[PDB]
Amino acid sequence: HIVRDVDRPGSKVNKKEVVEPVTILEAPPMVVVGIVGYRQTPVGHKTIGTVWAHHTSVEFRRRFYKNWKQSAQLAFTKRKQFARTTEGRLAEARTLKAFEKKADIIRVVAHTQLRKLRNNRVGVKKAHVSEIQINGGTIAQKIELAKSLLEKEVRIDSVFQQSEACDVCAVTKGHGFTGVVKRWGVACLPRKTHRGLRKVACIGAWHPSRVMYTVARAGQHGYHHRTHLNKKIYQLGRAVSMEPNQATTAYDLTAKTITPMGGFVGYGTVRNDYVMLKGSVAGPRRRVITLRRPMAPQTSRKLTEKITLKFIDTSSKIGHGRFQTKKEKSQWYGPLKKDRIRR
Amino acid sequence: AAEARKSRDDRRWKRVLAKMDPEKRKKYHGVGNTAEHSRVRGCTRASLFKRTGRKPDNIVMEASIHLSKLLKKRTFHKRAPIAIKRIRSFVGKLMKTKDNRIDASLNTFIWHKGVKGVPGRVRVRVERKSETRKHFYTVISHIPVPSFKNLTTKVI
RNA sequence: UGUCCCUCUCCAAACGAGAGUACAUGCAUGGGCUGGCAUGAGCGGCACGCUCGGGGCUCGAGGGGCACCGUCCCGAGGCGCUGAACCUUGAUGCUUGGAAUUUCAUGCUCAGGGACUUU
RNA sequence: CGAGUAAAAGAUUAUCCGCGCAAAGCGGAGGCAGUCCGUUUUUUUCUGGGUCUGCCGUUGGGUGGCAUGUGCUUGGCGCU
RNA sequence: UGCAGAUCUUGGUUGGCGUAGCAAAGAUCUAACGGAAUAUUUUUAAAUGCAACGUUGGAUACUGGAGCGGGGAAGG
Ligand SMILES: [Mg+2]
Ligand SMILES: [Mg+2]
Ligand SMILES: [Mg+2]
Ligand SMILES: [Mg+2]
Ligand SMILES: [Mg+2]
Ligand SMILES: [Mg+2]
Ligand SMILES: [Mg+2]
Ligand code: NA
Ligand code: NA
């Protein structure tokens, strides 16, 4: 959580301090490896073709195998032998000509870098692959941007801006098989109920002589895909290796990083770029989440407000943390018994 | 055919990264392989494991087992019998054996605080023997210690 | 050439299914960190103890009992060594890649085994 | 074995590519020897060296960019 | 003296079905011996013989004298 000053004329908190919980997400730079184009038909959009980069990393090619270390690792080997030849160059020009002539949508294939995100608890080593649409400009200009981006890194600060809103797509936490009370929120039954009270008393009338789809039943709860709207961006931080004073504001001059004392529980340390979103996001820790540019109009006073952080909390999330930094804790306690042994 | 000795990319990268070490100010904290309290960059840790022959049939090993992490929120009247099974599987996996004798000294120590009071930590002595294909088996015994601090696995 | 089973992990999980890993700081053990409780056993009473080789410190008890005045003993509790001692990842906290008169260090793997793919 | 593309555009999709409107029109293309088959238009293959680009995997070398242990861009060497 | 049914009579067979279950009286562990019940492979050790039984020694725990103690009547 953080502390900030709000600017909202006519409100009771105008020019006053508030406390807001936030969510921290680690964002290593992505790599662009492909270009795809789409054309419109009376039955929907159809892919035209794909242009691949000449050099791809091992973490990208790990995705196309179930047992990478015990395989022949032959993916993309034939294409590498042909792409840069005279015939290969001609074939690539033919595909790019088709994109210019008859495409409607231009997208780029990108993947994450789990090697740079050196997390001890995230076990997956094969990269996550997805498509990102390119908006703005004519079709020719879209293709020009995609070619310049091929085989290069993209940092999150070049996509989003601070004090902007965004949309979150994620899968929620799972709960397995669940009863109607938790799954749907129905009311419990009196205490004297024979055969149990955590149920729905009547599941239908005599006619129609079947159960309808609108009646609550027991089943799977959680692990669903959801899309949530209008999450403001409170900070776009950079990697701790470059600038260590991540959590230092103009009103709190203490030098500290964004990782709390003792580390995030079950995750560890944040070692790369990161984004601070106001509120909560779906899913547990360590899960991969997609952020996209807003869909709803962004013209309200709440959406256009400028955010200026004043204080950032870094106490331990294990127990009741009461020290902001390691130096603060070692100032409260004097020299302990172990330190006496050392000296 | 699956030899693939290679080990060359490590050679190339280490000679390269040494080449542009000359800078006005280096920074680049760990990029140079000269660093303290750090891993060796460019290769896996398992590549540095010393490979010898197969160990002899007759060996003796001293090891500690953290039992409280294996018995958490377990049903009370099952803790002592479960701990016996966990110790057997712990040792058997290490020694690649299915015959593991428990011996009275270790069995008494596990049960010496009742069925629901299994001690959190234990130190054991494991000896592997063979007799007559050949048959391998293990004998596990108790090693009383005053404290468990600063104790690590040893091979005699 | 590939997929699955056995062995390993948990963002998943009634069983199937899933996310993963395939000698990997992977697993185990220990050390630090961060937290929880609240000051262990043993010994001791103006020093030959504790604290800041030599110099400055500081050191209880309501009562009771032997032995011709002190000395020797029994006594809940209290004080010193002592923010000591113990626990801290396991259905599953951090740390071997920011820096730091200190944060990580050892041990085990030794051609993985099996089924199918008419390819 | 019962053959219909929300595909292309031609010696009936064969007999090369690039630009161009299913235009007008304008550009580029290695050569030599056998063999083996062949109802002609420089006939099909398979073979052999001599060879020249683009390009692999390389021997090392130096310039450099990227978030900095992992791969790239350079620039030569001898190798298909 | 001719059968398809009488909630027909007597035998046999049958889906349901390897299903519903076999959940009061707290609880077993270990080594040696016994046993045909193993340490069972040809096509190094683990990933190809599992699971379970009695006696003795040791450990743990229950009954708790209105006892899963020691004797009788009725009944057997
Ligand atoms: Mg009732
Ligand atoms: Mg907490
Ligand atoms: Mg009849
Ligand atoms: Mg059953
Ligand atoms: Mg029942
Ligand atoms: Mg009782
Ligand atoms: Mg009792
Ligand atoms: Na009832
Ligand atoms: Na009785």
Side-chain angles (χ1 to χ4, degrees), chain A, chain B residues 1-12 14-23 27-53 55-156:
Chain A
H1 67 266
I2 51 100
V3 176
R4 80 180 187 86
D5 210 346
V6 304
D7 158 80
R8 185 175 312 152
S11 173
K12 229 167 291 287
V13 288
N14 192 28
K15 313 196 316 321
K16 284 189 175 4
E17 319 224 274
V18 301
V19 175
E20 313 250 49
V22 295
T23 309
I24 308 296
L25 309 139
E26 205 163 6
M30 300 183 91
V31 179
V32 164
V33 297
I35 310 170
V36 289
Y38 289 88
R39 67 195 180 88
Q40 176 69 280
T41 74
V43 295
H45 281 103
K46 279 176 186 175
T47 320
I48 303 170
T50 316
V51 176
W52 288 113
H54 197 44
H55 307 101
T56 54
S57 68
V58 165
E59 35 184 12
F60 168 69
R61 307 199 306 270
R62 266 175 170 269
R63 174 54 69 178
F64 310 111
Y65 287 97
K66 243 70 191 163
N67 200 340
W68 161 263
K69 302 269 302 197
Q70 288 188 5
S71 70
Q73 307 162 356
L74 289 168
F76 285 86
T77 39
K78 284 281 192 59
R79 194 194 171 89
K80 180 165 201 171
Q81 231 69 240
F82 161 77
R84 239 50 158 181
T85 73
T86 87
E87 263 63 43
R89 292 195 196 272
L90 287 176
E92 165 187 49
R94 262 175 220 124
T95 291
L96 286 174
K97 164 117 170 294
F99 281 5
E100 157 134 23
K101 217 130 193 81
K102 70 180 47 142
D104 168 359
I105 300 169
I106 295 294
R107 296 199 204 156
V108 284
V109 170
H111 74 87
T112 61
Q113 306 200 88
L114 289 159
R115 217 207 316 260
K116 294 200 160 304
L117 177 114
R118 348 186 64 90
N119 196 260
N120 288 112
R121 305 309 303 286
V122 165
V124 51
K125 283 169 182 165
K126 36 164 77 161
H128 292 106
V129 195
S130 89
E131 283 186 9
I132 305 170
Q133 192 163 296
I134 293 165
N135 277 351
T138 69
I139 298 290
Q141 288 167 328
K142 294 185 207 277
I143 294 167
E144 212 45 90
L145 175 70
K147 280 232 281 303
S148 87
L149 278 193
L150 252 197
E151 217 174 315
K152 282 198 171 353
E153 280 188 348
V154 184
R155 285 171 93 160
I156 193 154
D157 63 50
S158 75
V159 179
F160 289 106
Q161 298 283 273
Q162 210 255 341
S163 279
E164 262 193 1
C166 79
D167 282 346
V168 175
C169 317
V171 183
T172 67
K173 295 164 67 173
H175 294 110
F177 209 90
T178 310
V180 294
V181 163
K182 177 173 198 178
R183 200 182 191 213
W184 291 95
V186 307
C188 281
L189 297 167
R191 186 203 53 90
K192 322 174 56 162
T193 309
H194 190 44
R195 293 197 206 91
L197 50 97
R198 284 174 80 82
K199 285 134 132 205
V200 164
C202 173
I203 66 169
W206 196 320
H207 285 110
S209 306
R210 51 204 174 268
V211 184
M212 316 223 278
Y213 76 102
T214 55
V215 177
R217 318 235 73 188
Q220 164 85 26
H221 184 53
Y223 203 69
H224 312 313
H225 185 277
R226 293 292 179 265
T227 297
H228 293 148
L229 300 195
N230 295 337
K231 306 283 186 177
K232 295 269 305 201
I233 298 189
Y234 272 10
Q235 195 188 145
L236 279 177
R238 340 210 64 238
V240 70
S241 340
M242 312 193 194
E243 306 121 359
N245 294 343
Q246 301 174 318
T248 295
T249 84
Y251 310 69
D252 196 39
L253 288 320
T254 300
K256 26 188 252 186
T257 77
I258 208 61
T259 306
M261 257 180 111
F264 283 115
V265 181
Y267 185 86
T269 317
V270 176
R271 307 166 158 96
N272 317 99
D273 298 340
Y274 67 93
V275 52
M276 179 190 300
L277 283 196
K278 174 194 177 179
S280 58
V281 300
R285 68 247 184 160
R286 313 200 279 262
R287 196 163 272 176
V288 48
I289 292 164
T290 294
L291 312 177
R292 87 172 177 202
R293 303 199 57 82
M295 217 93 177
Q298 311 279 309
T299 50
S300 149
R301 286 209 196 166
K302 215 169 78 133
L303 265 334
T304 53
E305 190 186 0
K306 212 223 163 303
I307 309 303
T308 324
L309 299 182
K310 199 154 291 206
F311 165 83
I312 296 172
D313 190 82
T314 42
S315 59
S316 99
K317 308 309 170 196
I318 296 162
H320 289 238
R322 62 179 184 102
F323 303 112
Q324 288 305 308
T325 57
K326 226 159 289 303
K327 215 197 75 200
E328 182 180 356
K329 171 170 174 174
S330 89
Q331 267 176 358
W332 174 277
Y333 297 98
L336 287 182
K337 166 184 249 211
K338 330 286 316 203
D339 309 25
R340 228 209 190 291
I341 309 306
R342 263 201 254 290
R343 183 58 228 152
Chain B
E3 279 53 45
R5 304 294 95 146
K6 205 196 44 63
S7 165
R8 179 209 199 171
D9 315 47
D10 168 316
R11 184 265 342 160
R12 199 172 17 237
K14 79 202 192 205
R15 78 171 50 263
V16 162
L17 263 305
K19 192 188 129 305
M20 53 309 275
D21 206 338
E23 308 186 45
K27 321 110 180 146
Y28 282 57
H29 290 306
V31 194
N33 252 327
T34 78
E36 319 331 331
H37 305 345
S38 46
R39 80 168 179 117
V40 164
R41 306 211 182 160
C43 66
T44 65
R45 187 178 160 252
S47 288
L48 280 35
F49 186 70
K50 280 207 296 318
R51 301 273 170 194
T52 51
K55 273 189 156 96
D57 317 319
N58 223 310
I59 54 182
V60 179
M61 148 172 97
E62 262 181 74
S64 320
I65 305 177
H66 192 176
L67 289 168
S68 58
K69 67 181 261 212
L70 304 183
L71 310 158
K72 204 208 157 182
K73 280 179 67 101
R74 195 91 23 191
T75 304
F76 277 146
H77 76 84
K78 289 204 201 147
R79 292 204 177 211
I82 284 307
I84 294 293
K85 286 175 146 185
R86 290 295 184 274
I87 288 163
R88 265 211 189 92
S89 99
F90 182 98
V91 162
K93 257 169 180 60
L94 278 161
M95 300 269 113
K96 317 240 187 76
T97 46
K98 275 150 92 47
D99 195 10
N100 312 295
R101 337 267 170 102
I102 283 304
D103 152 37
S105 47
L106 178 55
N107 187 74
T108 310
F109 177 76
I110 296 294
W111 278 90
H112 97 281
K113 257 155 96 160
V115 78
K116 17 197 237 273
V118 186
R121 277 169 164 96
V122 66
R123 188 106 171 139
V124 290
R125 186 170 169 283
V126 175
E127 160 144 38
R128 196 177 65 195
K129 318 190 218 152
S130 197
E131 51 161 336
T132 147
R133 281 228 163 225
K134 261 180 322 175
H135 179 73
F136 292 82
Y137 70 92
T138 266
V139 178
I140 317 152
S141 46
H142 178 235
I143 300 201
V145 287
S147 140
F148 289 89
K149 284 157 187 16
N150 294 275
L151 289 182
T152 45
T153 304
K154 309 262 155 75
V155 158
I156 304 326

